């Protein structure tokens, strides 16, 4: 399979190179027939000749048009003739562009930034990651001592360490006397021997998390220091920046790029991001540790368990999103160094440059600065969301949209070349926003995102028709990459730095969107009896009151093929579950209950270890009183008596500690919050105290601020101090509840004493 492509240059002739792995055999193809180009629409034909005589300079060297070519293309759907202009090498494009376009005979210029060997994967049809062949993957992190102030690489690196399937393995140059790590000379050594694993192991992709960021720029900053090069590419070259870094005959797969745009965490600590996808949480040693290990030799083992451990689950996580990544490359066309490094609208700008070309489509120019920002300052309405209906509710389903977005832009033609296109036998009309999409054909981006809907399916039909994972399981990543990429149309229509941007289709299939999502909630009313109780864009719920569970499951189906024969095109509706009961606080913020006791909330729940033990208990007495028990009553009458115990000292003091990080050195911080002032006095009392450390404190009944007040929770008495119950009732019990019980009309008031 293809696994990347780039240029090199001889005398002056740029060279194709293409990075293969072929039945388990690295292999280089090479091609050195590709000239760059771009296009010229020119004002009139007899100038062509005068154009061809702007010349440019670079490194002294004269740039000049070594050929045109006329060629009849289609800009947005009409024909358009345009000169394609060739040059000798593409970094003469640059030094030439501005000149062409400034000159008076030509009106505009296009496809003048193209990266040149992806230029080449278009144009031939080549696409990457296609085949059968097993990548070897390896991965690896170092750690490095750093001391507060120091600007980065200043201290050495120590530990090396990598892991792959078979071996975990790391490299000091500090005597650790355990089976997997290896001690050598120096730091000078340990870059050298590492450099002989790679040799050795010689693997097609290398793991890093945050690796364009830190691990490779701290490896070139101290390899340059000590004298040394880092000929990690296949070809021997040194890892290019670009920031990333590119490791020429592999891939440099950074997980910090996928994994930060596919889960949504707090912090992307590699730790938090371990146990969020795999469950086991992972032990993390902070820098002050690590360094005082290495200045004496205390707890050099457990270093050693950290930097093995570092490259192990550096490893896991990049085996588990690789195939992924790889299916979407192969459906992208590009390879997987730039697919796992780009924003969902860049892998769609890069799908439709593919399909222009195959389409002769000539691509529109990306905007310029301005033009970009006039796009920012842009906005439209968005989806329909509705004000909720209050109380408690038994019965609820949830009935929502199948690719809202996808089927609007099929079923009505949304796309730049059919908007308000004069001359046309039918028009589908936007509502409120009036925008006109012609139907007389169909537009370019409706059509491909046709193909991707309609080739999902097929691959979700031949899945079944299986017995193997070795495409079952290939398949459902190739299916799920294109849902990936069919539910990033819409975004790119807004995407400020899009070639093919069209704000007006945006905001036609948002529009359509909530016409279609307000008619589902007319029919749901006005002729099956329904109350929908909440709408958020393209799904509600909605229960019969006083019906049975299982009527309104009844009609809730029936209601899906009802309303599905008169939604036009591929607009369906679809149901999606049934609740035993649930309530409303605002928008985005419910909580519902299913038929195993399951209680799923959303916008309301407290789970911060910034709260006290006695607030994330009485929540959920609160949630399961209303939900388990449908008493709303009790549910007031728990925040009231917990309130109680409270101002009488009655909850014990482990449910009321507070735990925080300091995140810095003590010196460095103005804002003296709680745990701050703790860890202070903790210091002038001798105890040590570095960044990372958690506190946890209790604060104590007193004058002003609580930032005084606070005192160790492992210091707390209560034959010797009383906590401040006003404090714990104002600040934590009380903001975890309110909301949730204001929407049954309640108060704070309401919840005292």
Do not use: C
């Given at each position: 399979?293809?696994?990347?492509?780039?240029?090199?240059?001889?005398?002056?002739?740029?060279?194709?190179?293409?990075?293969?792995k072929e039945n388990g055999e690295f292999k280089v193809e090479y091609d050195r027939n590709f000239r760059p180009y771009i296009y010229a629409l020119l004002k009139d034909d007899s100038q062509i000749d005068e154009v061809r005589k702007i010349t440019a300079?670079?490194?002294?060297?004269?740039?000049?048009?070594?050929?045109?070519?006329?060629?009849?293309?289609?800009?947005?759907?009409?024909?358009?003739?345009?000169?394609?202009?060739?040059?000798?090498?593409?970094?003469?494009?640059?030094?030439?562009?501005?000149?062409?376009?400034?000159?008076?005979a030509v009106i505009d210029i296009f496809e003048y930034d193209i990266p040149f060997a992806k230029r080449y994967l278009i144009d031939k049809g080549l696409i990457p990651m296609e085949g059968d062949e097993e990548l070897k993957l390896l991965a690896f992190d170092i750690e490095t001592l750093y001391?507060?102030?120091?600007?980065?690489?200043?201290?050495?690196?120590?530990?090396?360490?990598?892991?792959?399937?078979?071996?975990?393995?790391?490299?000091?140059?500090?005597?650790?006397?355990?089976?997997?790590?290896?001690?050598?000379?120096?730091?000078?050594?340990?870059?050298?021997?590492?450099l002989k694993v790679i040799r050795e192991k010689d693997p097609d992709v290398i793991i890093t998390y945050n690796g364009d960021s830190f691990d490779l720029p701290y490896l070139v900053k101290r390899a340059e220091k000590l004298g040394i090069k880092l000929p990690l590419g296949r070809d021997g070259s040194e890892p290019k920046m670009q920031t990333a870094v590119e490791i020429k005959g592999r891939i440099h797969f950074d997980l910090y790029h996928v994994i930060r745009r596919t889960i949504n965490l707090p912090t992307y600590t590699l730790e938090?991001?371990?146990?969020?996808?795999?469950?086991?949480?992972?032990?993390?040693?902070?820098?002050?540790?690590?360094?005082?290990?290495?200045?004496?030799?205390?707890?050099?083992?457990?270093?050693?368990?950290?930097?093995?451990?570092?490259?192990?689950?550096?490893?896991?996580?990049?085996?588990?999103?690789?195939?992924?990544?790889?299916?979407?490359?192969?459906?992208?066309?590009?390879?997987?160094?730039?697919?796992?490094?780009?924003?969902?609208?860049?892998?769609?700008?890069?799908?439709?440059?593919?399909?222009?070309y195959e389409r002769n489509?000539?691509?529109?120019?990306?905007?310029?600065?301005?033009?970009?920002?006039?796009?920012?300052?842009?906005?439209?309405?968005?989806?329909?969301?509705?004000?909720?209906e209050k109380g408690l509710w038994e019965g609820l389903v949830s009935l929502d949209f199948r690719s809202l977005y996808p089927s609007i832009i099929i079923t009505h033609n949304v796309s730049p070349d059919t908007l308000n296109r004069e001359g046309c036998r039918e028009y589908d009309v936007a509502p409120e926003v009036g925008h006109k999409f012609c139907k007389d054909f169909p537009g370019f981006i409706p059509s491909l995102l046709k193909r991707l809907l309609d080739e999902r399916q097929e691959i979700k039909r031949k899945m079944k028709a299986s017995k193997d994972p070795i495409e079952k399981k290939m398949l459902d990543y190739r299916q799920r990459a294109i849902k990936i990429l069919a539910n990033s149309y819409y975004g790119y229509y807004g995407y400020a730095k899009a070639r093919w941007y069209c704000k007006e289709c945006a905001e036609s299939v948002t529009a359509w969107g909530r016409e279609y999502i307000e008619f589902v909630r007319k029919e749901l009313e006005e002729k099956f009896g329904f109350k929908v109780l909440y709408i958020d864009t393209d799904g509600l719920y909605a229960t019969i009151p006083g019906a049975k569970p299982e009527e309104i499951k009844k009609k809730a189906l029936e209601f899906v093929d009802y309303i599905n024969a008169k939604l036009p095109g591929l607009l369906e509706l679809e149901y999606e579950g049934f609740y035993v009961r649930g309530f409303f606080v605002t928008k985005k913020k419910y909580a519902l209950i299913d038929e195993e006791g399951k209680i799923i909330t959303r916008g309301l729940e407290i789970v911060r270890r910034d709260w006290s033990e006695i607030a994330k208990e009485t929540q959920a007495k609160v949630l399961e009183a209303i939900l388990k028990h449908g008493n709303v009553e009790e549910a007031v009458k728990i925040v009231k008596e917990v309130t109680e115990k409270l101002s009488k000292y009655e909850i014990p003091p482990e449910k009321l500690v507070i735990y925080e990080q300091i995140t810095r050195p003590l010196h460095e911080y103005k804002a003296i919050g709680p745990h701050v002032a703790v860890a202070k006095r903790l210091a002038a009392r001798g105890v040590k105290v570095r960044p990372g450390m958690v506190i946890g404190y209790i604060v104590l009944r007193g004058d002003g601020p609580i930032s005084k007040r606070a005192i160790l929770a492992e210091e707390f008495d209560l034959r010797k101090h009383k906590y401040d119950a006003e404090y714990y009732i104002e600040n934590q019990v009380l903001p975890a509840v309110l909301r949730i019980l204001e929407a049954f009309g309640y108060r704070k008031e309401d919840l005292r004493w």
């Open positions: 399979m293809i696994l990347d492509a780039d240029y090199i240059t001889e005398d002056g002739k740029p060279i194709i190179r293409i990075f293969k300079e670079r490194h002294g060297k004269i740039v000049r048009i070594i050929d045109a070519e006329k060629v009849r293309k289609k800009f947005l759907g009409r024909p358009i003739e345009v000169w394609r202009l060739y040059f000798e090498h593409p970094q003469d494009v640059p030094a030439i562009r501005d000149k062409i376009r400034e000159h008076s001391h507060e102030g120091e600007e980065f690489a200043k201290g050495p690196i120590i530990m090396i360490s990598y892991a792959d399937e078979e071996e975990a393995k790391v490299i000091t140059w500090k005597k650790i006397d355990l089976p997997y790590v290896e001690v050598v000379s120096s730091e000078r050594e340990m870059i050298k021997r590492f938090a991001v371990y146990e969020a996808i795999f469950g086991k949480p992972k032990e993390k040693v902070y820098a002050h540790e690590i360094a005082e290990a290495w200045e004496t030799g205390k707890g050099l083992e457990r270093v050693a368990k950290y930097s093995m451990e570092d490259a192990k689950v550096t490893y896991e996580l990049g085996r588990e999103f690789f195939p992924m990544e790889a299916q979407l490359s192969r459906l992208v066309g590009q390879p997987l160094w730039d697919v796992s490094r780009s924003s969902t609208g860049n892998l769609v700008e890069w799908y439709l440059l593919r399909k222009a489509e000539l691509a529109p120019n990306k905007p310029d600065e301005r033009e970009y920002e006039r796009r920012l300052r842009e906005s439209y309405a968005g989806g329909y969301v509705k004000e909720p």
